[PDB]
Structure 1
Amino acid sequence: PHMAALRPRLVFHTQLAHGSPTGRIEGFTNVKELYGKIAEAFRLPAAEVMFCTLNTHKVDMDKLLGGQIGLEDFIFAHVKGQRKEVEVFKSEEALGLTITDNGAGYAFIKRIKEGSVIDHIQLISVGDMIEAINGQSLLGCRHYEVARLLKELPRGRTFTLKLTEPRKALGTGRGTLRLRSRGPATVEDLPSAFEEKAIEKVDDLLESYMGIRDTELAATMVELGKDKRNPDELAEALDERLGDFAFPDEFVFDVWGAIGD
């Protein structure tokens, strides 16, 4: 699934910073339309909206809207698939299994240690839920109960597992709505730790050089310059939209170093 196909509507909640009940808004592709929607929700002229802060009603510039509005977690449900029954020979006291459960009566395999006797059996995977051990049914049992039975299996013998596989077709992967200054909004991944730091550096340069801050613009420049391979490619790119800023080439060089490894 491509991220933008997941939600038909991106609905957000909003309040006036000085105090109001919550309104719900949706259907905007830039900040002007965002402001429009909020004003509409509260029976205000659109001209009255100054700026937005995220997750605080205080005038907190650290939390000023700056090109990103985060989304809620998307929930993927794994349902029952192929049922298996696998015979395993306990040849080591430790089989290599870490058991969890779904907090509702199903226990399943969360970790398989590489090298372990379990790892050497190909027919068992992470995610497989354990339905029975040696014919003893385990639906309704907690992970620790299942874990215990596993530990106490006779170390000289072959045991059987009844398993159900779920059907199958860094960061957390949580989505964000990226409000771009130079075009329509997009759904993106969250910026990496590296990118956030590079964004702060560029925002610092915007201040020291131009007497401004703009996290959205900073992010735009970071995204823009990443597959540029020299300050000249970068400078060409800055000029493609941002001529009026009249970036001194020292700024370009500075930005160029700011967005690197």
Structure 2
Amino acid sequence: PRLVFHTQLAHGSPTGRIEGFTNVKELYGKIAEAFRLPAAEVMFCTLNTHKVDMDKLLGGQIGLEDFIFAHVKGQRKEVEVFKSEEALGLTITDNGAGYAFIKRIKEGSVIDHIQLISVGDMIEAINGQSLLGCRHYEVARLLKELPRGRTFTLKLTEPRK
């Protein structure tokens, strides 16, 4: 786990590179090393500004503060929907890997009324017609085309919980 940080002198310099640091004293030493200065010459460090902004003072560790949770495929569902209005009331994106799912369900909508359709549900078929290869905007196109006043069928998959 090696972190690399970009570095300049606040008064103007080329960009130096700095490896991850544990405390603030080590940082100054590393900065001074990369610019060939006695480490006692560094006063303080700022973040994303060369200006003397004390709200942007850097006095702690920097690092990946991100925990990534992955959602696996879980329960398969098949629900009927009666398209009574023009708008089903859902929003569709895709994960950039072929699966398009529900990002939003507008409150009060036709879909919002259906207990067994929740957000993050992958849509696999419309009336048994598979949606493989279908971009999110092509899926939403198919839905709007569907006959208003008739019932259609979705094959879905909830993420496991």
**For the superposition of Structure 1 and Structure 2, which TM-score range results when normalised by the shorter chain?**
0.7 to 0.9
Change (3 A) 1:67 1:113: same
Q: What is the aligned-residue RMSD (CA, Å)?
A: 3.4
Which whole-Å CA distance do the structure 1 matches of 2:61 and 2:20 have between them?
Answer: 16
> Scaled by the length of structure 2, what TM-score is found?
0.73
Identity %: 100
Give the match for residue 106 of structure 1: 99
CA contact (8 A) 1:24 1:41 kept: yes
What are the superposed Cα offsets for residues 149-184 of structure 1, whole Å, 9 maximum, x if unpaired? 21222233331112233344xxxxxxxxxxxxxxxx
More helix by share: 1
Q: How many pairs were matched up?
A: 161
| Correspondence list, 1:50-89, <5 A | 50-59=43-52, 63-65=56-58, 77-89=70-82
CA contact (8 A) 1:36 1:46 kept: yes
| Correspondence list, 1:23-172, <5 A | 23-59=16-52, 63-65=56-58, 77-103=70-96, 105-168=98-161
1:96 shift after superposition? 2.0
Which whole-Å CA distance do the structure 2 matches of 1:84 and 1:95 have between them?
Answer: 18
CA contact (8 A) 1:85 1:160 kept: yes
Q: Could you say what secondary structure the match of 2:112 adopts?
A: helix
Which whole-Å CA distance do the structure 2 matches of 1:99 and 1:45 have between them?
Answer: 57
Query: Unaligned regions of 5+ residues in structure 2, if any?
Result: none
CA contact (8 A) 1:97 1:112 kept: yes
CA contact (8 A) 1:93 1:155 kept: yes
1:11 shift after superposition? 4.7
More strand by share: 2
Which whole-Å CA distance do the structure 2 matches of 1:69 and 1:162 have between them?
Answer: 45
1:14 shift after superposition? 2.0
Question: Higher relative contact order at CA 8 Å, sep ≥6: structure 1 or structure 2?
Answer: 2
CA contact (8 A) 1:130 1:161 kept: yes
> Scaled by the length of structure 1, what TM-score is found?
0.49
Which whole-Å CA distance do the structure 1 matches of 2:35 and 2:107 have between them?
Answer: 58
